[PDB]
Amino acid sequence: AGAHVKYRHLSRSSAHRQALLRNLVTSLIKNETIHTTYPKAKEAQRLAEKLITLSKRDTETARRSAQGILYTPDQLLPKLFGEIRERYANRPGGYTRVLRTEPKDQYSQAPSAILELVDGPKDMRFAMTAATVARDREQKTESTDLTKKNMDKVTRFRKDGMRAFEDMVASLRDMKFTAGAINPKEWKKLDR
Amino acid sequence: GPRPTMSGATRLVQKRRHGFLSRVKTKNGQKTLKRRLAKGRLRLSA
Amino acid sequence: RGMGFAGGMKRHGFAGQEASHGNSLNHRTIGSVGGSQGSGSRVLPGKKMPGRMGAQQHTVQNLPILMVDNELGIVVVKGAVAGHKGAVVKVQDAVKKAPPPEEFVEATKQ
Amino acid sequence: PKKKTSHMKKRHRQMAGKALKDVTHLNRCPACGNLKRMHHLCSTCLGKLKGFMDRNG
Amino acid sequence: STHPTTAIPKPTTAVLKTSPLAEETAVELKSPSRLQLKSEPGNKGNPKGHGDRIWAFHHIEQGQVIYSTKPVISHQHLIRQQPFTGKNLVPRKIRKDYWRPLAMIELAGKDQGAVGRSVYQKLREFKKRHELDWANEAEEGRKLMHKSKRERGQELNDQKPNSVADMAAVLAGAGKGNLMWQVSRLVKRQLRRATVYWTNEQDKFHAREWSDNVSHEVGIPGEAEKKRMPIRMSS
Amino acid sequence: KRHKYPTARVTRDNSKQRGESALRKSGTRWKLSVSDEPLPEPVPR
Amino acid sequence: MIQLKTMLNCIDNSGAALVECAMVVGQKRHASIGDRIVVVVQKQRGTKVKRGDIRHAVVVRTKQKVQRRDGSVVRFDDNACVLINKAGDPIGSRINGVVGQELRKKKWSKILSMAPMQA
RNA sequence: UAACAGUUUUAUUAACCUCUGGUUUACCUGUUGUUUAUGUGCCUU
RNA sequence: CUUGGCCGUUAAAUGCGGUCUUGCAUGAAUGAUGUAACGAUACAACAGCUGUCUCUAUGAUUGACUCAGUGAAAUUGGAA
């Protein structure tokens, strides 16, 4: 009868909700990736992008605001205002990426997603595009406009860009990661 | 209704009140044994 | 404005029942739904009950136009209008009023 | 319940519009060729790539 | 607040190497203490004979060790020397049929009790640093961090091997301020003579190597009176 | 100690074993005289 | 917003000091500045009105905020009234204190004739 | 001609938040007790 | 009989308190009668206080609702 909800309450109390989001962002900056539900990945995203904006700011207030979101500031503040600040110094927003996956827990079947930091060491979309380009060059296939588009997305703001992307494709072909991949030209002749 | 009348029940009272010796040593207890023995009970007491 | 499933108080203005003088789980309930066997042994059609509210057409008549600006493209009318911001509304001359002067109907057409 | 529900009416409640809907939003993984869900990541490539980035680095 | 160390190589103040991590030996990390200079530090403010003998008792079943200055142990030693290692693992009392004397350290000078009270302190401090701050066993040796909290609590109760290594270190000058040293400051320093009595000849082999100032003997005084025969290797 | 009467200013921590545990490898509360020494490794049973 | 059992401060020289509302004359909604009511005198000041008398009164100022045409809003710290008769003219001869300016368009010229301050 | 000033009430139905209020459980500020982490931290030669 | 008569309390008193008596059908250890103190006893009044109410509104959690897992009961002559 009242107002529409401002945000997801995630079937939790106020204190629990705030703590849960702080943990999701504390593990994201510590591990650069987290595999959780889609609703939690989307709520922790808005708090993670606002925490990375605090690192870019040079005020003392920004440093106290970041200390009040992380759960181990003594260990993660150097990384926040260090490596991460340098990474997203030229990126105007959109510092995170949510990608849907299969249910992390088969009992619940709850829709799940991966929340990653773009241009990070564990960027999933950067590795999926390299595996595609690896399968193309190994099968003499022409990359689609959607593969080339993603190739520019994951190499525009990166430190070295294309160089770091070609080494991934080369290493994936060195270990035969694309062994057993079905050629796209044989997809229409498969019912299973 | 039924009540939890066996709460805090000690096994010392079971032997005193329903034990074998409470019966072989009394006139009315010899009947219980003889009755329970005629029926074929294995548990004559306690 | 839509309001989803509404009770009997918001939808039909029912007063509700007591709050503390013994009331048992029936503070915002609708009470009796009708009479007994003599009344039909049924709930009569048109009985006011909970249900969805809002998200329906509504007309407000006899609203003057205070300002008319072509550049901004706005037509300021007195009073309130149904719906949310950004929703499309229909504006037409009042039916319960006399049509605008003949000179105006011709000037605009001209 | 005043009476037992007949076989006709209980079958109506269980089958009228309760048919399990087929999943047609299926495409194939680009680097894998395996069938995945639309707009979702390949579960086979995820675990593999997620494990490949743990050894090299 | 607590501060746990890491299993990293460090320098030792003892003559021999206590652990494979020890960097150097016989390192002077601080100026000599007042009693270290003295040739004969006497029993200034302690009872007559106190300190000349130090006893060590152990649980012959679970390996729990307790140090004592007297030939016996009391309920105090159990409460003050045994940390909580889990449920059903801390005995509510001392059972006479489980606790036996592990060893006994006797110094040469039977009147320099101050040396024993120091050896007793380093031993209790080493023990507290074995039950806590066991970074050298988390991923190596017994690998306590790979075990369950139940099995971990039973391995932390077993301090008898560690204790017999703490003696070889404390008696070799391990620790800071260990009065087992004797600085001349004419600067030459040496270790004080000591004797260790063992109820089991095999127990003394937990220490990879012993110093050159310790004498090993079989049988602890008073145990033969209880009809408890010592264990000898050579038979 | 300067002031010895029972009501003197108490500036010590009366919780001796604060944050101290063996199962969680908390570490010693204070710096002991043997705190900078490598733990002696015995020979297993 | 004056309603049943509301206590008011009579600022008229009629004898009453604190009156209790007993009825809202001429409407169902709660009475505001310029509405008639029936009160019961509960206190006096010392043919004046004695404690327990039933008279008609007019709300001259209320503690509830009052919106006006020009957007100006007036709030008073207390609720006050002036006793009148069934005819409509005041019982007293003088009014002490400020009164609401809403008495103008509600046909209360007699009450404003002796109103020293209007707010 | 201009300028200035004045041109009902009650009840009920519905819509609507410009105004006047109420609400505000991931907003700002102040503040008590206690705990935890980090930083810092006494005199003297 | 009865909402007994009068007085006080309420804007309004079948209530409550005081008082008078003809008390259907009060009464003295089936005790009579009057105070102090006492009471989660019963009745009445005052002040304060409040969403009890005029007249409800918003906000919070758990259920309610949907997906996945497990899986009852009263009841039922037969039923288009």
Place this chain on the structure above:
RNA sequence: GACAUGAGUAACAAAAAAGAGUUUAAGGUACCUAAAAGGUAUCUUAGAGUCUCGCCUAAAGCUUAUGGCUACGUCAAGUAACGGCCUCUAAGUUUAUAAUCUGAAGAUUAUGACGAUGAGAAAACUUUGGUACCAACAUUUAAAAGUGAAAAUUGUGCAGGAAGGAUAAACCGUACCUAGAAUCUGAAACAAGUAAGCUAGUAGAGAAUACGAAGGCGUGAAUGAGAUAACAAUCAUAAAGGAACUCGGCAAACUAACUACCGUAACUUAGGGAUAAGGAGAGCUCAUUAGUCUCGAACGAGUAAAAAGGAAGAAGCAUGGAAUAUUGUUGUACGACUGUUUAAUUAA
């Protein structure tokens, strides 16, 4: 007895709470590879653990009982650091003996035997009746001080406070569970109930209230993930009014605790009423200091000493700052009063 219906519905909601990594064993799938294998990833079943967050905390912790359909490698001459068995007896019991009574069965008195919920030498080595007594209450006492016991000393009150015996190491118990997370009783894996000791610290008069160190927990999928409609439960706030609600101020709100503070009525059995009513004060900084304490050398200095202290001062909307203690007064009936009662609809 089997199988239907309700129904794949209700329910798996003690207002503690979860999040992200890691890993072991067995087995199922996919790919690599076709020399079987192995490897990589994933899933199922049964576990373990790390970081973070939270809940309990004079417990939901630890040590033990009553008890046990949880499981059997649980180890003692005795004291420190232990109970039983054994000795002695209480309340009582007695198909023991004698005497007596008695339709039979049996009952009574005496003695004996048995009977703990009590009493039992020594040890960190050991084998008479106030000249009193060991009920309650109070006090004193292991000499640096304080605190908590033990035992004893002294005294108080009336309600006047056991019995008996003495004074080279067998046998039995020892595992786990203690009820918020797998064990006791409640028909059960039940929001109930059950004995003893211990039960960090800050802060307090305190076992009150709040926080919580360690420990434990945040259930055996007996659940998990979403959404945040009506309505229900449990709460929070609220314009103006303030009982207009209602059988009735039901419920809720107001009030509240503290001080060696001020003040306190009718009436009274002279004890009370009374903590009546009604007011004042409170935290932080600071002037000031007789003694005690500390430091330096009588004196000087110090609150990195406890306290005292004033009409001092600062900041804020607010200094009983958060939590904890639920209004005051008046007239009657009944019963003096404190108590007791229909275990589980009547507490009067």
Place this chain on the structure above:
RNA sequence: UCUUACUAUAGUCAGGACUAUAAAGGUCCGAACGGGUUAUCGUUGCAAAGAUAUCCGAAGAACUAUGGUAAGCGAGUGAA
């Protein structure tokens, strides 16, 4: 082995206040403990008597533990 009464042996009642007492009170405020005043929830309940809040006693005619005795023609026990 529940429960009522009695009996023997034992145990428990933070702290504070008033009163003639250091200790003499079916004294006062209030935890543990013991009760169960009022309301709500619940009613195939967590529970065949529970939950939350509120309220009462809390040095006594108190509460609790382990044993013992008294019950079914006549009625044991009963502040009834």
